[PDB]
């Protein structure tokens, strides 16, 4: 009847309005995270047994707060009652209310909670990580309700895009405070659970956006002072959001309040080792895995990933004028220099040089090279520069006047044109027509293309999923060999190319590859395994035919980088390029029937095939730093015997100092490259392949995990789902048996062909139509929440008649 409604409201705010039927339930689609003994996943299920009431604000207007009430059994009733009685005093628990009503002649029990919010955090996280712009109604409602935007904003089409409409960051960042408060109240909930002696597993689908918690249904009780919270899935699923919405932006104000001035850090202070641990203890107190503020203390590669992931987030709070090399005044032959004696990354903490020799007597040729390539001496003796054309952090000016470089138009070969028009070509209405021309560019063309690095944002990665995608991508590369090679074995083509800055003032690469005997090069390559050498990259424009008027800019890295990177990587690089029948197809020619062999390779044994391909919009500049780091780690993994563990870490640090944040010398003044690959280094064409395979595996993982595991009919793939979730989140160490299992599943139902980001995939289709493998929308979702680019469906094709390739 109606006494139900006046019973539910209880004591406070009896402004109850039914939000459906009466004494019956209310079924809605919500995103859970289920793992019982029969099903895993992070998928939208059908929540049924709950009657939802909405409160009325004054003036008779509907307010954003609800009174849910479940209806379930009798043992869960008392169990819930006891656990709530124990957990009531915490501020981060929503007020329950247990009562018995009657529908027919029986006291059906209820849990009439109070003052909810319509959505949990699980809906927010799912909708951001599983985007589909065709139907994003839940995201629209969640955005409008919390005053982040207004409904009139969504009439501006391509609103969701990141390249177009770059203002959407300002819309998303308005959700930071709610998420930060959720983090804090989760910490307080964990403290209450521990001190109360309760053992339980935490999910996001039991936390309204305000911060409170509920559903103490599957908890168990232990002795007080000895409880344990389980937070592996919660934090790891929530990781990618904390940099979409900048949830830690309120940590740079004077007393962490948004209505205060900014903290003014000291100029010279660069350590920030205590602050990182304080942040970790405040927000991630119960993440029971050691977090090393500086990664030079890490034990192996996976710990380096696990600590770089946290440093990425914690480095966006500290000022960007303290990062970079940490120079030191060194006396040589009675003269003070300024030379780099370390580094300070955002993703690896502080790294110190091991072999530094102040009060040196004389400099060898190796010393002269390693001192004429460091930006410290250059920048520390140049005028300041404040460039308002760009948003990238400028550093200094080496000269007194900037230089403007233009791009000339290509010339005309008239005789061929006359011959063409003689033979009845270029007639109006013909299919063949001129479209590829030599475009021209005005004075400020170089800097207007360097400015595109503004599409690079500090991104967090789902670490407990990357620590498995990296295993599978690793298994994809177990067919080849690699190792360090000596100076007398490197193979270099075209020895008369430029030597970078400032070496291009004296001669081409031949001179520097010539003056060093076969012992100087090895001395340098063994020096870099215990030191860090920052370098200065030049930026040049290409002059080639094209169909689009945008310029193309390529980075000419200095010789001191590629000279050692060749020795480090060349064995593996030339073992990849000399293999036929693999996934990567670098080196396989299309002449003499190679293309036919490739196409018949990728059609291998799939059952109901359907082609699918793609390419990435601005692949080099939209690259996050974590995926670059992981790609370099996967490439350097093969050195299990030739190098130690400190040597491998210092080589990785050198790579990050040379191709990830190196001081680009664009024009006539140094800038700071924020992130992304520089396309003119030694291992671009293979790092891109590693990236592409990583995205493919991530799409497969997301597509298989996020499926309702009660409709899947083939038993084996359901067991695959369950074990996949188990080894992803409920586990900590690699399980090579299941890694082999999943890799076999992939290569049997997802065939691939890869070059540097230009891929082709042949997939079983009657599975992809049931979401057991990656479709072409899954790559859109992954690129959205991980690469920060929206994949337009005018660049991804899909083909179904295999007779045409």
């Amino acid at each position: 009847a109606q006494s139900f409604l006046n019973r539910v409201c209880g004591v406070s705010a009896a402004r109850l309005t039914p939000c459906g039927t009466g004494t019956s339930t209310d079924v809605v689609y919500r995103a859970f995270d289920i793992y019982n003994d029969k099903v895993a996943g992070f998928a939208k299920f059908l929540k049924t047994n709950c009657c939802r009431f909405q409160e009325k604000d004054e003036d008779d207007n509907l307010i954003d707060s609800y009174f849910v009430v479940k209806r379930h059994t009798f043992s869960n009733y008392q169990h819930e009652e006891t656990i709530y009685n124990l957990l009531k005093d915490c501020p981060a628990v929503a007020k329950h209310d247990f009562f018995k009503f009657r529908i027919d002649g029986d006291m059906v029990p209820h849990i009439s909670r109070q003052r909810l919010t319509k959505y949990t955090m699980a809906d927010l996280v799912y909708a951001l990580r599983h985007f589909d712009e065709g139907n994003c109604d839940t995201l629209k409602e969640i955005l409008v309700t919390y005053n982040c935007c207004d409904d009139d904003y969504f009439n501006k089409k391509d609103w969701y895009d990141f390249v177009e409409n770059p203002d959407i960051l300002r819309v998303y960042a308005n959700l930071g405070e709610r998420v930060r408060q959720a983090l804090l109240k989760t910490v307080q909930f964990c403290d209450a659970m521990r001190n109360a002696g309760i053992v339980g597993v935490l999910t996001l689908d039991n936390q309204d956006l305000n911060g409170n918690w509920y559903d103490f249904g599957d908890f168990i009780q232990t002795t007080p002072g000895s409880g344990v919270p389980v937070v592996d899935s919660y934090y790891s699923l929530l990781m990618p959001i904390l940099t979409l919405t900048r949830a830690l932006t309120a940590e740079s104000h004077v007393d962490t309040d948004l209505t205060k001035p900014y903290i003014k850090w000291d100029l010279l202070k660069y350590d920030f080792t205590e602050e990182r641990l304080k942040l970790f203890d405040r927000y991630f107190k119960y993440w029971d895995q050691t977090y090393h503020p500086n990664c030079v203390n890490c034990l192996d590669d996976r710990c380096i990933l696990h600590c770089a992931n946290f440093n990425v987030l914690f480095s966006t709070v500290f000022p960007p004028t303290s990062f970079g090399p940490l120079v030191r005044k060194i006396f040589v032959d009675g003269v003070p220099f300024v030379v780099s004696t370390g580094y300070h990354f955002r993703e690896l903490g502080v790294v110190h040089n091991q072999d530094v020799n102040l009060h040196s007597s004389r400099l060898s040729f190796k010393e002269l090279l390693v001192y004429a390539a460091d930006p410290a001496m250059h920048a520390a003796s140049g005028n300041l520069l404040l460039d308002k054309r760009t948003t990238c952090f400028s550093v200094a000016a080496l000269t007194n006047n900037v230089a403007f470089q233009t791009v000339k138009p290509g010339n005309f070969n008239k005789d061929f044109y006359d011959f063409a028009v003689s033979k009845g070509f270029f007639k109006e209405g013909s299919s063949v027509e001129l479209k590829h021309f030599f475009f021209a560019q005005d004075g400020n063309a170089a800097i207007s293309d360097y400015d595109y690095y503004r599409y690079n944002l500090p991104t967090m990665c789902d670490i407990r999923q990357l620590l498995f995608v990296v295993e599978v991508v690793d298994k994809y590369f177990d067919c080849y060999d690699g190792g360090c090679i000596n100076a007398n074995q490197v193979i270099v083509n075209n020895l008369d190319k430029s030597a970078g800055f400032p070496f291009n003032k004296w001669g081409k690469a031949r001179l520097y590859y010539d003056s060093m005997s076969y012992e100087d090069q090895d001395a340098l390559f063994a020096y870099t395994k215990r030191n860090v050498i920052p370098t200065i990259t030049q930026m040049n424009l290409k002059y080639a035919i094209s169909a689009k008027n945008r310029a193309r800019t390529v980075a000419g890295v200095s010789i001191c980088s590629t000279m050692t990177n060749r020795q480090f990587h060349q064995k593996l690089l030339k073992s990849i390029a000399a293999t036929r029948g693999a996934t990567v197809v670098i080196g396989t020619s299309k002449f003499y029937g190679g293309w036919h062999n490739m196409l018949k390779t990728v059609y291998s044994d799939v059952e109901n095939p359907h082609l699918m391909g793609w390419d990435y919009p601005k692949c080099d500049r939209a690259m996050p730093n974590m995926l670059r780091i992981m790609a370099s780690l996967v490439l350097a993994r093969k050195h299990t015997t030739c190098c130690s563990l400190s040597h491998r870490f210092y080589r990785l640090a050198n790579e990050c100092a040379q191709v990830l944040s190196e001081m680009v010398m664009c024009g006539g003044s140094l800038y700071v490259k924020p992130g992304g690959t520089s396309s003119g280094d030694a291992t671009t064409a293979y790092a891109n392949s590693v990236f592409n395979i990583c995205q493919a595996v991530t799409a497969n993982v997301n597509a298989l995990l996020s499926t309702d595991g009660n409709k899947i009919a083939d038993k084996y793939v359901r067991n695959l789902q369950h074990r996949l979730y188990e080894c992803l989140y409920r586990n900590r160490d690699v399980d090579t048996d299941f890694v082999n299992e999943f890799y076999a599943y992939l290569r049997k139902h997802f065939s691939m062909m890869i070059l540097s980001d230009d891929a082709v995939v042949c997939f079983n289709s009657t599975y992809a139509s049931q979401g057991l493998v990656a479709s072409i929308k899954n790559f859109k979702s992954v690129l959205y929440y991980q690469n920060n680019v929206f994949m337009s469906e005018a660049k991804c094709w899909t083909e179904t008649d295999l007779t045409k390739g």
């Binding site: 403007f404 138009p409 010339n411 001129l434 021209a440 560019q441 004075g443």
Partner: protein, 72 residues
């Protein structure tokens, strides 16, 4: 007919560039902008007005003696 316009815009920009027109940044910016719009045009009539605008730049100076160069 438009292909002839694109080709003549290419050669016109080349002769303008070797006439040392890029010493004044604004003029070179206007010229390169017009040339890019001519090359990307899909129809003939706007190509021709941008063409005459681009040719007026060459006619403006005195470096290209026209009466001799027009020898028929």
């Amino acid at each position: 007919k438009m292909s002839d316009v694109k080709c003549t815009s290419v050669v016109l920009l080349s002769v303008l560039q070797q006439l040392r027109v890029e010493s004044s940044s604004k003029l070179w910016a206007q010229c390169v902008q017009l040339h890019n719009d001519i090359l990307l045009a899909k129809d003939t009539t706007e190509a021709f007005e941008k063409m005459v605008s681009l040719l007026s730049v060459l006619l403006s100076m005195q470096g290209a003696v026209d009466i001799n160069k027009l020898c028929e």
